[PDB]
Ligand binder design. Sequence first.
Ligand SMILES: Cn1cc(C(=O)NCCN)ccc1=O
Length: 115
Amino acid sequence: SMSVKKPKRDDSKDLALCSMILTEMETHEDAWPFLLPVNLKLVPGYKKVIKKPMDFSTIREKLSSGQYPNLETFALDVRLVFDNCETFNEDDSDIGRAGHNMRKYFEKKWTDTFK
Ligand SMILES: Cn1cc(C(=O)NCCN)ccc1=O
């Protein structure tokens, strides 16, 4: 509360660590469904069904222009990519399985980096 300061973690490296985590995502071989925004004019149903589209390049742009206030909002956009994926794809499709793989890949790097 007011004048009651909780001891807080060092966040000076958060930007560089999130950038390196995103780089590992972008270079993962299963990252192809998520590198670029879903083409709303070439895919039937996505614009209406998916109310918050998100992809790695948009996350990269928001990270490179100071649009994430903290690292929690960064992980929100990353998880939004895979939440959208589950909403729109079957689990045993190539894209649906890539999302599950990429999500598990992310959450371990998130724990190994900040926890
Ligand atoms: C990540 N993601 C990719 C597609 C896509 O590109 N579909 C083309 C079908 N061959 C659709 C939904 C989704 O969430």
